[PDB]
Amino acid sequence: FTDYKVADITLAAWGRRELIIAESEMPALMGLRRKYAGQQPLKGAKILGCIHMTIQTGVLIETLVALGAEVRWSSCNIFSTQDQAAAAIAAAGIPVFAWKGETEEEYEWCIEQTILKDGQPWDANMVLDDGGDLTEILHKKYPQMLERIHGITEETTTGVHRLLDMLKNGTLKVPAINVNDSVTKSKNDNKYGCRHSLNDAIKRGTDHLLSGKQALVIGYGDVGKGSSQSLRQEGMIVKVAEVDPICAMQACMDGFEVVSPYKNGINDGTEASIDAALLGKIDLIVTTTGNVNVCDANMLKALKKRAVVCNIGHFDNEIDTAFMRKNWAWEEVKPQVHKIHRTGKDGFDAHNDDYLILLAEGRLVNLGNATGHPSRIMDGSFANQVLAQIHLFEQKYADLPAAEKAKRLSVEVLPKKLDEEVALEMVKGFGGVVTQLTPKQAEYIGVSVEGPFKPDTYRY
Amino acid sequence: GFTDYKVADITLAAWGRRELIIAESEMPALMGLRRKYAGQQPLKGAKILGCIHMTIQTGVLIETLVALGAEVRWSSCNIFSTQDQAAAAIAAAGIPVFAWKGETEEEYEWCIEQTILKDGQPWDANMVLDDGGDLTEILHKKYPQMLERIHGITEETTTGVHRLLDMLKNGTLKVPAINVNDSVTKSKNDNKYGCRHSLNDAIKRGTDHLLSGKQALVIGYGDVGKGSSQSLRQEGMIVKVAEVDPICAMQACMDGFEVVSPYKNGINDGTEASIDAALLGKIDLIVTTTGNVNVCDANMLKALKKRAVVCNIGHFDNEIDTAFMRKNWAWEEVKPQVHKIHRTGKDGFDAHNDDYLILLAEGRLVNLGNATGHPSRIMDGSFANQVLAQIHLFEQKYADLPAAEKAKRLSVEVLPKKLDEEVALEMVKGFGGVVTQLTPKQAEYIGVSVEGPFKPDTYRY
Amino acid sequence: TPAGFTDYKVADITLAAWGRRELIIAESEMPALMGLRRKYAGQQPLKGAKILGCIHMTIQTGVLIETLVALGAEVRWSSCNIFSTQDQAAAAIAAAGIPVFAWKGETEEEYEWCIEQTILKDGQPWDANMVLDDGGDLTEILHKKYPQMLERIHGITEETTTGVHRLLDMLKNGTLKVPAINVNDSVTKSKNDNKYGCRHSLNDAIKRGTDHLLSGKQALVIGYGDVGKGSSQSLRQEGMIVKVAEVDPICAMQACMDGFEVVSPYKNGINDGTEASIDAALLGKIDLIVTTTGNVNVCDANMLKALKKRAVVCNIGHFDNEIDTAFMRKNWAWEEVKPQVHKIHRTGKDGFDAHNDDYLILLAEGRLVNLGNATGHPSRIMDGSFANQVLAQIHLFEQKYADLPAAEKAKRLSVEVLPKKLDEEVALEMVKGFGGVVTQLTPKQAEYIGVSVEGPFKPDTYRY
Amino acid sequence: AGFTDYKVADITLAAWGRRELIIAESEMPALMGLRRKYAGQQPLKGAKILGCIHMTIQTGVLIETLVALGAEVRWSSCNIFSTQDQAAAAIAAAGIPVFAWKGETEEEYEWCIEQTILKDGQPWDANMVLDDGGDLTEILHKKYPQMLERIHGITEETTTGVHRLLDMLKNGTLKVPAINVNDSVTKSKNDNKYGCRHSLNDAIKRGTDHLLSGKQALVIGYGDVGKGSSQSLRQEGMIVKVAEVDPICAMQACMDGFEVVSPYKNGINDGTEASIDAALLGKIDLIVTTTGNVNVCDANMLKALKKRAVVCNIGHFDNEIDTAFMRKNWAWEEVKPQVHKIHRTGKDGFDAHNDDYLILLAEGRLVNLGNATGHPSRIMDGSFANQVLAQIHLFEQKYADLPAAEKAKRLSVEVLPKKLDEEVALEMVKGFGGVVTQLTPKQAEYIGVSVEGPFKPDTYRY
Numbered sequence A: 001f002t003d004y005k006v007a008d009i010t011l012a013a014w015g016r017r018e019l020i021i022a023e024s025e026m027p028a029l030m031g032l033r034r035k036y037a038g039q040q041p042l043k044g045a046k047i048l049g050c051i052h053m054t055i056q057t058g059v060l061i062e063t064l065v066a067l068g069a070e071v072r073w074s075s076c077n078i079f080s081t082q083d084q085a086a087a088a089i090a091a092a093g094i095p096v097f098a099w100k101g102e103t104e105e106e107y108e109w110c111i112e113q114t115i116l117k118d119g120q121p122w123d124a125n126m127v128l129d130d131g132g133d134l135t136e137i138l139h140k141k142y143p144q145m146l147e148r149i150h151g152i153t154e155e156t157t158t159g160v161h162r163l164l165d166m167l168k169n170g171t172l173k174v175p176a177i178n179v180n181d182s183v184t185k186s187k188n189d190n191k192y193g194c195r196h197s198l199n200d201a202i203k204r205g206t207d208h209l210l211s212g213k214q215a216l217v218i219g220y221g222d223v224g225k226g227s228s229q230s231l232r233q234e235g236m237i238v239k240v241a242e243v244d245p246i247c248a249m250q251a252c253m254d255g256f257e258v259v260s261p262y263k264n265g266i267n268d269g270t271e272a273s274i275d276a277a278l279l280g281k282i283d284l285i286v287t288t289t290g291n292v293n294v295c296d297a298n299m300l301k302a303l304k305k306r307a308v309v310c311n312i313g314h315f316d317n318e319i320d321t322a323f324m325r326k327n328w329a330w331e332e333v334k335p336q337v338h339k340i341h342r343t344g345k346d347g348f349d350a351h352n353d354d355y356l357i358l359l360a361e362g363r364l365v366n367l368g369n370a371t372g373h374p375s376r377i378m379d380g381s382f383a384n385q386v387l388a389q390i391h392l393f394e395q396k397y398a399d400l401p402a403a404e405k406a407k408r409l410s411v412e413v414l415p416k417k418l419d420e421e422v423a424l425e426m427v428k429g430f431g432g433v434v435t436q437l438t439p440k441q442a443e444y445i446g447v448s449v450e451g452p453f454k455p456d457t458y459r460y
Numbered sequence B: 001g002f003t004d005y006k007v008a009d010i011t012l013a014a015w016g017r018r019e020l021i022i023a024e025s026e027m028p029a030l031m032g033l034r035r036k037y038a039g040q041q042p043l044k045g046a047k048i049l050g051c052i053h054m055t056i057q058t059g060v061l062i063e064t065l066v067a068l069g070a071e072v073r074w075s076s077c078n079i080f081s082t083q084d085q086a087a088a089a090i091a092a093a094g095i096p097v098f099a100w101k102g103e104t105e106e107e108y109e110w111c112i113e114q115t116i117l118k119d120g121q122p123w124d125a126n127m128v129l130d131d132g133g134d135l136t137e138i139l140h141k142k143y144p145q146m147l148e149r150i151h152g153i154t155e156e157t158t159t160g161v162h163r164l165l166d167m168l169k170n171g172t173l174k175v176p177a178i179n180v181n182d183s184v185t186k187s188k189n190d191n192k193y194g195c196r197h198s199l200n201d202a203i204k205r206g207t208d209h210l211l212s213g214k215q216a217l218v219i220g221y222g223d224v225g226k227g228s229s230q231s232l233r234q235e236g237m238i239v240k241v242a243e244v245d246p247i248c249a250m251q252a253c254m255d256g257f258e259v260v261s262p263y264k265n266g267i268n269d270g271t272e273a274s275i276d277a278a279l280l281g282k283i284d285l286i287v288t289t290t291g292n293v294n295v296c297d298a299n300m301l302k303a304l305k306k307r308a309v310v311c312n313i314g315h316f317d318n319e320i321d322t323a324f325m326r327k328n329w330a331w332e333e334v335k336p337q338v339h340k341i342h343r344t345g346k347d348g349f350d351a352h353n354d355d356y357l358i359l360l361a362e363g364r365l366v367n368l369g370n371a372t373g374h375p376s377r378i379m380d381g382s383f384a385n386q387v388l389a390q391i392h393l394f395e396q397k398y399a400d401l402p403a404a405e406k407a408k409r410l411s412v413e414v415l416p417k418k419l420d421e422e423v424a425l426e427m428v429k430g431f432g433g434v435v436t437q438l439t440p441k442q443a444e445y446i447g448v449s450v451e452g453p454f455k456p457d458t459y460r461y
Numbered sequence C: 001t002p003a004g005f006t007d008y009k010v011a012d013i014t015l016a017a018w019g020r021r022e023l024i025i026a027e028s029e030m031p032a033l034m035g036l037r038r039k040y041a042g043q044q045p046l047k048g049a050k051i052l053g054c055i056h057m058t059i060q061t062g063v064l065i066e067t068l069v070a071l072g073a074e075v076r077w078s079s080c081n082i083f084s085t086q087d088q089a090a091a092a093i094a095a096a097g098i099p100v101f102a103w104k105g106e107t108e109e110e111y112e113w114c115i116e117q118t119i120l121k122d123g124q125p126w127d128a129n130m131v132l133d134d135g136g137d138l139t140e141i142l143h144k145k146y147p148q149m150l151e152r153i154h155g156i157t158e159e160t161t162t163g164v165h166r167l168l169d170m171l172k173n174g175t176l177k178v179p180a181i182n183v184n185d186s187v188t189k190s191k192n193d194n195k196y197g198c199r200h201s202l203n204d205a206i207k208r209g210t211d212h213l214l215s216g217k218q219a220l221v222i223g224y225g226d227v228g229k230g231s232s233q234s235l236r237q238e239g240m241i242v243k244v245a246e247v248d249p250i251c252a253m254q255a256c257m258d259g260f261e262v263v264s265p266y267k268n269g270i271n272d273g274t275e276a277s278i279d280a281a282l283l284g285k286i287d288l289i290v291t292t293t294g295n296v297n298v299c300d301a302n303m304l305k306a307l308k309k310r311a312v313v314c315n316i317g318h319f320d321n322e323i324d325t326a327f328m329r330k331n332w333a334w335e336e337v338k339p340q341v342h343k344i345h346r347t348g349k350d351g352f353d354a355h356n357d358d359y360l361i362l363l364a365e366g367r368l369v370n371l372g373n374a375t376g377h378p379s380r381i382m383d384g385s386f387a388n389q390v391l392a393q394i395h396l397f398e399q400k401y402a403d404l405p406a407a408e409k410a411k412r413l414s415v416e417v418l419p420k421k422l423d424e425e426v427a428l429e430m431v432k433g434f435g436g437v438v439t440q441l442t443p444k445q446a447e448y449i450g451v452s453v454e455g456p457f458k459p460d461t462y463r464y
Numbered sequence D: 001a002g003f004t005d006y007k008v009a010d011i012t013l014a015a016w017g018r019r020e021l022i023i024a025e026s027e028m029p030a031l032m033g034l035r036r037k038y039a040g041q042q043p044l045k046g047a048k049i050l051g052c053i054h055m056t057i058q059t060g061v062l063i064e065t066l067v068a069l070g071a072e073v074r075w076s077s078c079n080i081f082s083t084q085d086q087a088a089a090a091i092a093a094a095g096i097p098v099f100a101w102k103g104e105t106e107e108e109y110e111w112c113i114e115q116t117i118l119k120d121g122q123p124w125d126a127n128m129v130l131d132d133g134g135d136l137t138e139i140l141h142k143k144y145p146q147m148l149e150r151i152h153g154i155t156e157e158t159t160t161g162v163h164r165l166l167d168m169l170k171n172g173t174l175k176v177p178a179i180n181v182n183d184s185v186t187k188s189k190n191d192n193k194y195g196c197r198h199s200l201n202d203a204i205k206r207g208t209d210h211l212l213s214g215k216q217a218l219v220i221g222y223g224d225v226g227k228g229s230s231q232s233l234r235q236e237g238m239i240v241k242v243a244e245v246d247p248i249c250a251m252q253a254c255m256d257g258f259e260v261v262s263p264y265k266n267g268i269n270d271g272t273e274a275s276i277d278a279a280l281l282g283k284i285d286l287i288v289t290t291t292g293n294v295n296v297c298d299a300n301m302l303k304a305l306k307k308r309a310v311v312c313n314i315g316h317f318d319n320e321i322d323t324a325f326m327r328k329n330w331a332w333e334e335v336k337p338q339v340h341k342i343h344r345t346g347k348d349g350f351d352a353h354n355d356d357y358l359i360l361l362a363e364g365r366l367v368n369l370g371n372a373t374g375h376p377s378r379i380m381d382g383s384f385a386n387q388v389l390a391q392i393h394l395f396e397q398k399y400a401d402l403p404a405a406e407k408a409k410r411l412s413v414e415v416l417p418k419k420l421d422e423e424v425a426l427e428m429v430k431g432f433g434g435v436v437t438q439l440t441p442k443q444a445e446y447i448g449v450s451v452e453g454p455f456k457p458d459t460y461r462y
């Protein structure tokens, strides 16, 4: 077997040890192996996969394979691969192309290696994606391959937005399942995963004490909520910025001061609009928005000396890192940790005190400077992923008559019953015991004893 | 010579007015609507039957509706939830209100009846504001001819919405409704953070018990269960959580709570043997938050640790089997809304008996029964939504529509997201928070308008 | 119960049955105190003791009083604050035939009269021989006005930080006439009562007084000692954004590490007396200020003028002079919202507009807010403090300082704490009250760390 | 240039270590303040310090502060797993004798201490000792008493080392005076508590990447380390139970919101398996020892633990857990450095998919230093500022030069004055941007203090 490329195949044994541990931490995913192994619902599936090549993704990969699928895999970020996980998957005879520290060109090459087998397009029929890059490449560069694919399963918030924009424009070619908006994905991954892994990555990269220092979290969606908690629980004084007043209300009620980097919240492009008094007191800024340029050049110039800057959103344009590359001198402390000297562009004084510390070059800090979300959290997201692959593959969209395809081209979610069944396995993993309604109680609140227990409008 | 009211003590009116003036400073979203709409008088001609806890916060709501042109006739939706100084102030302002703290069940229904009838005949009502559905039920059961002239119902709480949706499903709902509960500035503000503030508040006022280091069991982990669990955990209780919904149970685990069931393996078969006696014997405090029936049953009550506190913060008292306790155990009143329940028998008690439970508010809503409910700055969000919902349905004029147009409009709906955000913005500004404004490039990048809405309707926050 | 008993003064004797019901509940919440009652009742270690008592006449103090009585003592009691009495507690004590002079809402004149009613019986000095005090007021009156009574008194047992400081000043000045036990500095007192008590009761009192939402609002806590630590937690756990002021850099360090921003009301921390030294921008953002220092004028007139409109002002230290309420009485108009809640209108002295927006809310007129606007610390916390009080009373009464020759007296004139072994035994009963299980050292383990299996487990230098 | 008087894992890591030292200096304002304050005075000129403490980046800033004030040093680590190899490299590259690397054997650990004691095969002309745990102190008293004759004092970092010093003093075997650095409030109530709060969950995440929220933890001990450890886990969402032999510390755990339990039925440890609360230990996902005592996670507790539980120790010595029992009876599978699965199915071999194992971190050694980087610089700032002030005080006292009659009056184990404790604290507070208020003269008079402090009596517990 030579159909792979990883950093060091001799790490496979180490990766396999950590995969065995992770399986014990992922009861929903392993429950799917046990219950669907007999049926083999993915027998004949040929999955193109593009998501962070972590130990957790390795357990997802081997679940798909255990249920009958063939896969070809790559990472969806240059810094997120765990090299021992990629080696373990390659050593199992599974095509994977990923290592930690890829270039932008190597990242694109890796995706192309899953798409192409022996210089020709693989006969893929299913797509698993995280962020929409593989989806984007298949639509623009390989649009004929999409005629054989039954569906796409997208993992993250940003990629779902890209899916919906394509549907509005009439450019989506196959059906997709929004895995993100399962409650066991969104309200488990996006929030709780960042709570675990944000402070984790900051400690590994800098070993800075967080207690008693000032943080500014930009955004208070699910990622901003978990991020703010990750810092507040360490004893940081956390301020939150938002453009959504409802999320801002939640931040107030959660015990945070809501501030704007700009005077009266008005970002008019001038240095005068920056609240320099506020930014001159901030020790740490974290972007969580999925928007562009929310930590902009004028903010970076006003930040307190020696502040830490990082991004836990999907793309590295939340921080204006291009401005910093253009104007300031970068000193690498260690991999994925750079001191950015605001004294000038060419050279720096090794003892200069006027610098910022940038983590992971503005890329996803939890995966770049640590190991991202823990297995027991990723268990929820990835159990949803397996179910969505099963559902789309059994639908067989690519084999439908043209008129039947037009009614099937949509972006749907999984039914709440499956969402609840994933949750039940996660609860049992904690040793929790769910109570069963009596028939009278179920009638009283208007549900079935079996569930679902909430209407589809419920927000939890 | 205004006499069209009944309250405990009208001489409390000046005190109530002092607290109303303070509360107004704490309710910027509600007072903003008052200032914004006062000239337009959008509720001129509205005649609102209101049934909701006659608190100081409800007083500000009432006087906002009146300031926008409405006439109202008011009662409380719970026998223990009224603040008599608030009722006095409303009555002294010439507004018909029938409510006092400590009503009997007969007085409770008499009070609702006094809003429905004026001078012994049906009032010319055309709007309903309700909390829990009791008024709504009486109208449908006893006054269908009045509903023919009513434009809509604005319902405050989860239990009342469920009752509306049952009527809609059965085809017995006679007028459209706005689900005020499911605004985010209500459900994820009032139901959650309101109970965070007021649950431990009511327990302290009722018992003055230290909570830190003691063991609590919260039944339910919806919005109220979430806020209640945090109310106890932030005080230092060791909180365990029960749930029938595995997604809510998942949240409780991830939020750092142990999830347990009162019943072995979660199976509630009705036998004493099914009770986890070891667990129940460790619990110092049980709080029910479900909106369900009999979630703290007789066998749990028998197995509870001696001197544990029992209370309910759901809408109705049947979450606890208090009927079993009246029938079997002797009740000793410590003070109003605080009773020791002696499990030694029904015929009297030893004053020094150690085997008792403490029941708060006789199982009625504990935060309102033993304290003052949610604070003004939280009820600001709920009641701003109520005002906007009243305006919307009154302006729709459902009762004046042809039969075919009524059929197209008979529904239970929520307010649009844009209103939800505008209520939130005034709440944030009340804290002194500063929302950031998107640039045109940023708004285009994420696909929203600069003024919002900022989230799809599917967003869960 | 005694026939014709009139030797008392309370608000409303008809509250007695309610008070008794709450005393019976509190007994179940105070296992260390009730354990002493059960362990020592037969021995009657306080038979012959005649105790002058001055401490907040709460339900918790009622359990302490009746423990001392159950061990053989006679007492005459008053409260140590004009607003801290629970009237149903005083009524139940009076109904039991125990002389008590206390009600909620005393004037300063009545407060002094109440202490004098304990000191006197039938117009003449009572033959007291023990003193239990909280804050030093009774101690001071005895030294200043009735020094001859101190000749027959065996000891003083002082409850709180402020009172201990007053005792230590007297000792170093040679004006202390009897030995004392510093009950405050038992760990089961200071690090339980002073910290955890305020955590429970500060937000309790603020809620009862104002019903204000605390989540999301800005608080300034002046001081970060034991009371300031517990107060800051009381507010932070509600979701307040809490800033902390301190003069002690070590306490300030703890505040930083505990997750609080440390700030001063004065620019660069320097109070030069002028309004220009006030950090007006900081104070104009504060919704709630709480004084916790035991010091004087730590929320001064210039701070009060700079506070954000409609801010809440309160004090949880022992004496009301932490806030400059005198200045507010001189210059601003007071509007009573309800008992122990006043709006203070900064528009002027004479009248006020009922809809004026420029006011502050003062709780308990600056007196101890937790006792003034709620019920102070809960029973299970006061268990620790008052168990120490009983043991201190037993130790000093059994020592019989007043019966010693003048030479032997000067050798034992001291302010002492109880030994750590007793501190530990009180803690053990508290832990058992929660259902906690303490592990027992093996002989090899106790030898390894150099302690006895039964303790004490820590050197006297240990800070916990 | 020509410097060979060291032994580190990899000298080429020096530039990386120097980069981290420069960052750490910006995080240690109290230590760097002492450098600026005393550089001209050179108060340690002539001091020759034997140092034995974790060779971390933070210790590097301490070492160079001592050198900047005039001292010469010879350094080693006090734990086989706690060295950061880039820190040791940076120190050796600056021409400072250091013998330390991560992952030493027991024989290498003792060899390293001996390399500081001896120079060119003979006793170095040492006159000061800086110790963390008492290992270097014990070797000097047992094996080099002639060297102690010329040593002016010992400055001891940690609780376990202080207890050993007090035992020597009690038995009349302590030969030179000592300063208990541990019991400065800016050490004990900063390092021991807040440091473990930061670095405990840090080390657990690095070693296992386990989700902690919603899982069950048992902390043995509720002293300073146990307090900070319990908070480290609780703030992550763990359901933390606490064990204690001290009822006062147990009272604090209760009031702090923890359930207090014992591994033994009714807390009675009689040596039998029957005494183990198996139902309690069968629900525990993580056990952490914090006591400084022996065998507080014994063999019967280990046999009863829930399958796949994590076992770690953050007290100074590994004997808090009965790891010797596990080496004799169970098969060890290394996951990665300082992470071992202990298979409870037998001693000879294991099934790679066996589910009945425990995960042991750092082989039972200090887990925060073993599996992460110990406490962060801004916390170690306080501890090491105290160390520098303690070295200055004892070196200036010149105990070794005093007559016998005067030595007897100074042979003691003391703490630093509270005024200095406060001066360290103020620099820490200023590092956060905190602003301390200055008492007026009337306010200082009212509470009976000098305006400049000290502000508390020596009995105050904070």
Ligand SMILES: NC(=O)c1ccc[n+]([C@@H]2O[C@H](COP(=O)([O-])OP(=O)(O)OC[C@H]3O[C@@H](n4cnc5c(N)ncnc54)[C@H](O)[C@@H]3O)[C@@H](O)[C@H]2O)c1
Binding pocket: A156, A157, A158, A159, A189, A190, A193, A194, A218, A219, A220, A221, A222, A223, A224, A241, A242, A243, A244, A247, A288, A289, A290, A291, A294, A312, A313, A314, A315, A364, A365, A366, A367, A372, A373, B436, B438, B442, B454
């Ligand atoms: N690193 C990870 O492990 C991880 C996991 C999940 C999601 N993500 C990524 O994180 C991002 C956020 O995801 P989410 O689920 O929280 O989405 P979300 O929509 O729930 O939250 C984003 C929030 O940012 C706010 N926002 C937008 N522009 C802003 C601005 N200029 N200033 C302040 N706030 C602003 C929005 O109002 C919104 O509340 C996405 O890119 C997603 O792909 C990362």
Ligand SMILES: NC(=O)c1ccc[n+]([C@@H]2O[C@H](COP(=O)([O-])OP(=O)(O)OC[C@H]3O[C@@H](n4cnc5c(N)ncnc54)[C@H](O)[C@@H]3O)[C@@H](O)[C@H]2O)c1
Binding pocket: A435, A437, A441, A453, B157, B158, B159, B160, B190, B191, B194, B195, B219, B220, B221, B222, B223, B224, B225, B242, B243, B244, B245, B248, B289, B290, B291, B292, B295, B313, B314, B315, B316, B365, B366, B367, B368, B373, B374
């Ligand atoms: N007291 C107040 O101030 C206040 C405020 C808002 C709502 N409420 C009332 O509280 C109740 C709950 O409202 P909500 O918004 O939280 O609703 P919700 O639907 O969000 O939560 C109720 C939860 O109870 C759970 N549950 C049902 N039966 C159960 C059982 N047998 N055991 C355990 N868990 C069980 C459900 O799974 C659900 O998650 C309603 O009656 C509502 O009207 C009271």
Ligand SMILES: NC(=O)c1ccc[n+]([C@@H]2O[C@H](COP(=O)([O-])OP(=O)(O)OC[C@H]3O[C@@H](n4cnc5c(N)ncnc54)[C@H](O)[C@@H]3O)[C@@H](O)[C@H]2O)c1
Binding pocket: C160, C161, C162, C163, C193, C194, C197, C198, C222, C223, C224, C225, C226, C227, C228, C245, C246, C247, C248, C251, C292, C293, C294, C295, C298, C316, C317, C318, C319, C368, C369, C370, C371, C376, C377, D437, D439, D443, D455
């Ligand atoms: N209300 C209650 O229930 C209760 C309970 C116990 C004690 N107390 C009282 O509270 C007060 C404090 O007691 P404690 O045990 O916390 O004492 P403490 O000595 O432990 O704390 C007081 C703190 O105030 C700080 N301080 C002094 N002057 C200051 C100033 N100008 N600005 C800022 N900080 C300043 C000191 O540095 C000190 O840390 C005393 O009066 C005590 O009697 C009240």
Ligand SMILES: NC(=O)c1ccc[n+]([C@@H]2O[C@H](COP(=O)([O-])OP(=O)(O)OC[C@H]3O[C@@H](n4cnc5c(N)ncnc54)[C@H](O)[C@@H]3O)[C@@H](O)[C@H]2O)c1
Binding pocket: C439, C441, C445, C457, D158, D159, D160, D161, D191, D192, D195, D196, D220, D221, D222, D223, D224, D225, D226, D243, D244, D245, D246, D249, D290, D291, D292, D293, D296, D314, D315, D316, D317, D366, D367, D368, D369, D374, D375
């Ligand atoms: N890893 C680190 O970074 C670090 C930092 C400081 C100290 N330490 C070490 O940690 C240890 C503890 O230090 P400390 O300052 O917390 O000491 P401490 O004296 O404050 O606390 C130890 C506690 O353990 C308790 N204990 C003793 N035997 C017990 C048993 N069998 N079961 C349960 N509890 C028991 C004692 O009652 C005491 O409260 C020492 O070895 C110290 O040197 C480590």
Ligand SMILES: Nc1ncnc2[nH]cnc12
Binding pocket: A051, A052, A053, A054, A055, A056, A057, A193, A367, A371, A372, A373, A374, A378
């Ligand atoms: N550990 C992980 N594996 C895969 N995708 C992730 N996204 C966040 N954390 C992740």
Ligand SMILES: Nc1ncnc2[nH]cnc12
Binding pocket: B052, B053, B055, B056, B057, B058, B194, B368, B372, B373, B374, B375, B379
């Ligand atoms: N204060 C309050 N007023 C009215 N309704 C409420 N529901 C909960 N708290 C309330």
Ligand SMILES: [K+]
Binding pocket: A056, A371, A372, A373, A374, A375, D209
């Ligand atoms: K991970």
Ligand SMILES: [K+]
Binding pocket: B055, B057, B372, B373, B374, B375, B376, C211
């Ligand atoms: K209220």
Ligand SMILES: [K+]
Binding pocket: B208, C058, C060, C375, C376, C377, C378, C379
């Ligand atoms: K009380």
Ligand SMILES: [K+]
Binding pocket: A207, D056, D058, D373, D374, D375, D376, D377
């Ligand atoms: K470190």
